[PDB]
C-alpha cells in the first residue's frame, strides 16, 4: 500500500536537518540522540528504502543517487525547502521554529557573545528533545552554537564525580575543561577544520552522556569517558598538573591532605588510634583499586625498604608500623613485602621488606651450621654465604639482614643460645625444614647429608658444630667404602648404641685432618682383626665391632667369609674389575 | 606386544590401594591427589584401556569382572597379594611402608588415643606425598586414621581466614569444628554409617584443600569452603549463634565492637573526627560486599525512618549524621534513602529517608499551588494532595514530610514568604520542573494548563493562587468555546497587552461562582456587538475587541460572516453536527 517517497542523496545539510526533524522519535540523553540521526543518515545513503515514523504518521523513504527522467512519483532534491517537504508530509512544529532559527542565523551567529546568548536561550523557544536534536545536527552552523549548552553540562558532571575531597582541584579542572571545549568549539580560529572538531566533539559528547567516572590511573585523577576522545587532552593536562607534585610515602603524590598511589587516591589520617602517637594512616576515596586483606596481627620485626616489586598482593598478612605508616606486610615467594593500607584494603604499590637480625656474640658454632642448612635448603651458594659469614660485616641472606651492633632501632637477636633449630625458624618455608636431622644418627639423617655433599661437594670443610661434623664423617665413611660395603654397614650403624657420641666427642678435638684421613681409609675384616687400614686416628672401633660380628656368617669360604660378591679375605673387601695392571 | 597388565573389577580395597601406590605422580595438595585417585579408580570400572605411569616406568591396565581361564598376560585376580603385584611392576618404596601399616592395624586401630598416636607420628614414616595419598587411601581403616591430622590443619586455616579482628570468636568455631569433625571421623559410634562419612568427608577436605575464606551472609560469618559438604553444619551452627545476637543500628548484629550486616562486618568506631562528639563511624574488615561511592558532601536535612528498602545504592551521593553515626544518602527515584558507610564504600543495608518541613504559617496559597503543581508533575492524585491540606494535620508528599509545629527535630521550613517556585524546588526532579508557568500568559503557560485540566478535570476548583486562577480561567473559556474558534483566537490573546494582569485581577475578588458562569458561555460576532452570552461580569472584553478586529476579514455574510469551516451568525459560531432533531 504504502507510497515510498524519493530524497535525493546530496541534499544540503539544512534540508536534511529539516527532513530528519519530522521524526517523532523521543532520546532519552545525546547519545542515543546522535545514534538514531546516524542510522538515518546510514539509511539514505544505502540503496533500499526503510521506515521513518513522524510527528504525521509512519513513511518510506529511497534514497536516489541515480536520479533519471524515468517515472514521476514524491521526489525530493537539494533546491527543496520546508514548503516543498510540507507537500509530502505537513506540519512539522519542530522543522519549523527550525529554519526561523536558520533565518535569524545572521543575528546570532555575529559574536562569540551572539552565540552564548543563543546557546544559553535554547530553551525558551526549544524543548528538551528538540535541543538535542540540534546539537546533534547536520548544518555546522546550529550544531556547533547548542552544543554549546553542553559544556557546563559536562563541568557540573566532573565536579560531581570528583567529591567534595578534591575540590581544591576543581578550578584545576575547571581552566582545562574550559581551555580544551574552546579550542573545540572556536568558530573564529582554525575554520578550516572546523567540521572535523565538531564532529569529533560529538562522538566525544555520545561518550560523556549518561555518567562520568573519576579514576587514578599511575597517580593521576583521569576522567574515563574522555579517554579515546578529543576531550582527552584534559586527562593529559590534569597529568602535568599530578606529574610534577612531590614525592612521598610509598611513591606516591602528595597534594594538601591527599596521597595518590598508581590506582587509588588516599586522604592521609593523621593522629590514629591504637598506635604510637604520631603515626599516620591512609583513607581511599572515591573510586580506588587494591584487595580487601584480612589481617593476623600487628608485628613490629619489620624493616621498610626502598625498593619497589611487582608481585600480587597476597589476601592474608598482619599489619604494621612501618616509617610511621599503619601499613599491610605479608609473606610471597619466602620474603617480606609491605604495601599502603586502607582499613581492611590494600592497594598494589608494593614495596620490599627486610628483617635484620642481631648476631649479639658473633656467628657462632651453632649459628653457622643452621645459616649453612637454610643455605642446602634454599640452594644458595655455601661458599658464598661462608664469605659473608668470614667478613664479619653486615650482610643479606634468605631476606634478612645479620648486623653484629647493638641496633639501629631493629629488635630480633640471636645469641649464644642459638639452637640449630632456633636459626632454621628465621627461614622456615616450604623447602627450609626445622626438623632436628643432627643430632642424632639416623638413616634420614644419613640421608640429609648424603645428597648435601651431592650439591656440596666439600661441605666437610664448612660444618662447625659437633653434630653436624659427626654426620658428615659419617657420610665421608661411607662414601670412601663404596657401594656394597656400605649396603651391608647400613643394615647396622644405627644399631650400634653409642656410636654416634662416640662419633661427636672426638670430632670436638680431633677434627683437623680427620676427614682428610679417611679418604685412604680401605675396610679389610678377619676372623681376629678388623682394621680400617690406613687411619690410624680414628672414631669407629664400635662400628668395626658390629661389622665383622655381622661378617660371622656364610663362611663360604677360599680365603674368608663372602657376602654374595664381595669375598672380603685379608686383602680387603674387593671384587675384581677397577685399576690398571691386574692388582693383586 | 608388551605388558598390557589385567586386573580384575573387584579387587577388594587393600590391594586396590596398593596397586595404585606404585604411582608416580606428585600432587600439590588434597584436591589433586583425590582428583588422581578418582581418575584411576573410574578408569577400571570401565572395561577399557588406559595408561597408568609409575615409578617403575609406563604400564597400561584394564579390568572386567570374571576373567576366562588361560591368556599370555600378567593377570591381578581378586585375591591376590603384593607378591604377585611385584611378579608384575616391581618395586615400591611406599607400597611396601603400606603393608608394613597394614600388619601393625592391630596396635595402633584400638583405642582413639592410639589411633591419635598413629596420626600425628606418620610423617617418622611416611612423606607428605605419601601421607596425602593415604588420606585419599580406599581402606576406610587407613584413609580415615591418616585424615585425623587434617584437623588441625583445617582448624589453623579457618583461624587466619578469621583475622585477630574477631579472636573473640575463635572459641566458638574451634569448637564447632572440633565437634563435627569429630562425629564425621568417628571409628567406634554410628560404624554401620562409616563408609559414606568417610567418602563424604574426602570432598569436603578437597573444597578446602588450598584456600579457606570467610565471607558475611545474612549477617552471620560463613566459610565459603564449608559450604556444599558434610562441614557444612560448621555454618549452620555459627549462624545459630549470630542469630541470637542483639539487633542494632539499621538492623545489625551487635557483637562487642563490631556490627554484622547482611554482607560485611564493621569496627564500630567512637568519636570520629569530623563530627559531633559521641558520633559513631564504621570501618569494614575482612571480606566485605559493598559499593565504592563519591561523596559530594555533608547534609543535615535527612530524618533516618526504621525502615529497610531494596534498591541499589547509587555511586553519588552525600554524607549525613544519622541516629548519631556517620552515614551515606542518596537519592533515587525522587526519593531519599541510606546506607551504612565506611569511609567511602557503601553498605548494601539501604533504609529509607524523609524530608521534613516546617509549613510555620500553614498552607498558604502558594504552597497550596505549589504542592498541587508538583502532584501534576508525578501524577500524584490532586484530591488525595487536596483532601491532606484540608485535614491541618502532617502528612507523607513526595518523600517529604510537612508539619506544623516548629522545633519538632529536623529543618526546612515554608512561611508566608515563600513563592510557588520555592515550593517546586523542593521536589525538583526529572517530572518535577520549576519554570515559571503561572505568573503570566504564554502559549506554554496555556499549553500545561490545558493538559494538566485534562488529567485533572476539576482543577478549575482547587487552585488557590491569583495567577493559577487566571491561568485555569483561560482554559476554561477555552475548552468552553471549542478548539476551532480557539484555534482562531489563539492567534492574538497572546498580544493583547495588558490582558493577563486584567483576569488576575478580576480573579482576586470576583472568582467565586466564575467558572461555573464561564462554563455555560456562548460566543456572538457582529459588527455591532461582541459579546459571551450568559457570563453578565467577566474579565475578557479587551479579547472580545481583539475577536471583532479579526471578525474584519473574509465576508460573505451569508448568514453572516466566515473563516475557513464555520460561521458567525446573529446566533452564534456553528459547523453544523451532533445534537438531536438538527438544529436551529
Known amino acids: ?10 541534499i544540503p545539510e539544512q534540508l536534511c536537518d529539516a527532513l530528519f526533524f519530522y521524526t517523532s522519535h523521543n532520546p532519552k540523553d545525546y547519545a542515543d540522540a546522535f545514534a538514531v540521526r546516524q542510522k538515518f543518515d546510514r539509511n539514505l545513503q544505502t540503496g533500499k528504502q526503510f521506515k521513518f515514523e513522524t510527528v504525521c504518521g509512519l513513511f518510506l523513504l529511497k534514497g536516489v543517487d541515480k536520479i533519471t527522467p524515468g517515472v514521476p512519483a514524491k521526489v525530493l532534491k537539494a533546491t527543496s525547502k520546508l514548503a516543498d517537504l510540507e507537500d509530502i508530509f505537513g506540519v512539522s512544529p519542530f522543522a519549523r521554529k527550525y529554519r526561523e532559527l536558520l533565518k535569524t542565523a545572521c543575528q546570532w551567529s555575529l559574536t562569540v557573545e551572539a552565540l552564548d546568548v543563543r546557546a544559553q536561550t535554547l530553551d525558551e523557544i526549544f524543548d528538551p528533545t528538540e535541543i538535542l536534536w540540534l546539537q546533534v545536527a547536520a548544518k555546522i552552523h546550529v550544531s556547533s552554537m547548542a552544543m554549546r549548552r553542553l559544556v557546563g553540562e559536562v563541568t557540573a558532571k566532573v565536579m560531581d564525580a570528583l567529591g567534595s575531597n578534591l575540590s581544591a582541584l576543581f578550578q584545576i ?21 572546523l567540521p572535523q572538531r565538531i564532529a569529533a566533539l560529538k562522538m566525544a559528547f555520545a561518550k560523556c552522556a549518561r555518567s562520568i567516572t573519576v579514576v587514578v590511573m599511575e597517580r593521576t585523577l583521569v576522567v574515563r569517558e574522555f579517554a579515546g576522545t578529543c576531550l582527552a587532552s584534559i586527562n593529559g593536562a590534569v597529568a602535568k598538573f599530578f606529574e610534577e607534585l612531590p614525592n ?17 587516591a588516599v586522604r592521609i589520617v593523621e593522629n590514629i588510634p591504637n598506635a604510637p602517637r604520631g603515626t599516620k594512616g591512609f583513607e581511599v576515596v572515591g573510586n580506588a583499586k587494591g584487595t580487601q586483606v584480612v589481617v593476623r596481627g600487628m608485628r613490629n620485626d619489620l ?14 598478612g598482619w599489619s604494621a608500623i612501618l616509617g610511621g605508616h599503619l601499613c599491610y606486610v605479608f609473606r610471597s ?24 637480625v642481631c648476631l649479639s656474640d658473633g656467628v657462632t658454632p651453632e649459628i653457622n651450621d643452621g ?50 633449630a632456633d636459626v632454621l625458624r628465621l627461614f622456615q618455608s616450604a623447602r627450609v625444614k626445622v626438623e632436628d636431622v643432627w643430632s642424632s644418627l639416623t638413616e634420614k639423617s644419613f640421608e640429609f647429608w648424603r645428597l648435601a655433599y651431592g650439591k656440596v661437594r666439600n661441605l666437610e670443610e664448612f660444618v662447625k658444630t659437633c653434630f653436624c661434623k659427626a654426620q658428615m664423617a659419617i657420610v665421608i665413611l661411607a662414601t670412601v667404602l663404596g657401594e656394597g660395603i656400605w649396603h651391608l654397614v647400613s643394615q647396622v650403624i644405627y644399631k ?27 675396610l679389610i675384616v678377619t676372623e681376629t682383626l678388623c682394621v680400617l687400614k690406613g687411619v690410624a686416628q680414628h672414631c669407629f672401633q664400635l662400628l668395626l665391632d658390629a661389622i665383622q660380628f655381622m661378617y660371622k ?32
Open 1 to 10: 500500500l504504502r507510497d515510498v517517497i524519493l530524497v535525493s542523496k546530496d
Open 333 to 356: 615467594g619466602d620474603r617480606f613485602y609491605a604495601a599502603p593500607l586502607s582499613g581492611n584494603f590494600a592497594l598494589h604499590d608494593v614495596h620490599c621488606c627486610e628483617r635484620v
Open 371 to 420: 645459616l649453612i642448612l637454610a643455605a642446602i635448603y634454599s640452594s644458595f651458594s655455601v661458599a658464598e654465604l661462608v664469605a659473608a659469614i668470614k667478613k664479619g660485616e653486615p650482610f643479606k641472606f634468605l631476606g634478612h639482614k645479620f648486623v653484629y651492633a647493638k641496633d639501629a632501632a631493629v629488635s630480633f637477636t640471636l645469641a649464644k643460645a642459638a639452637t640449630i
Open 496 to 522: 650400634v648404641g653409642g656410636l654416634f657420641t662416640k662419633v661427636v666427642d672426638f670430632c670436638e678435638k680431633y677434627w683437623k685432618g680427620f676427614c682428610a684421613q679417611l679418604k685412604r681409609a680401605k
Open 248 to 264: 612521598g610515602f610509598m611513591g606516591a603524590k602528595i597534594f594538601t591532605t591527599l596521597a595518590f598511589f598508581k590506582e587509588a
Open 553 to 584: 656368617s656364610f663362611r663360604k669360604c677360599a680365603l674368608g667369609r663372602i657376602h654374595g660378591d664381595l669375598l672380603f679375605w685379608k686383602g680387603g673387601v674387593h671384587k675384581i674389575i677397577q685399576e690398571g695392571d691386574e692388582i693383586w
Open 173 to 193: 579542572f575547571k581552566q582545562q575543561i574550559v581551555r580544551i571545549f574552546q579550542k573545540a568549539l572556536a568558530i573564529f580560529e582554525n575554520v578550516s577544520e
Open 303 to 316: 624493616t621498610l625498604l626502598d625498593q619497589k616489586a611487582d608481585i600480587p598482593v597476597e589476601s592474608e
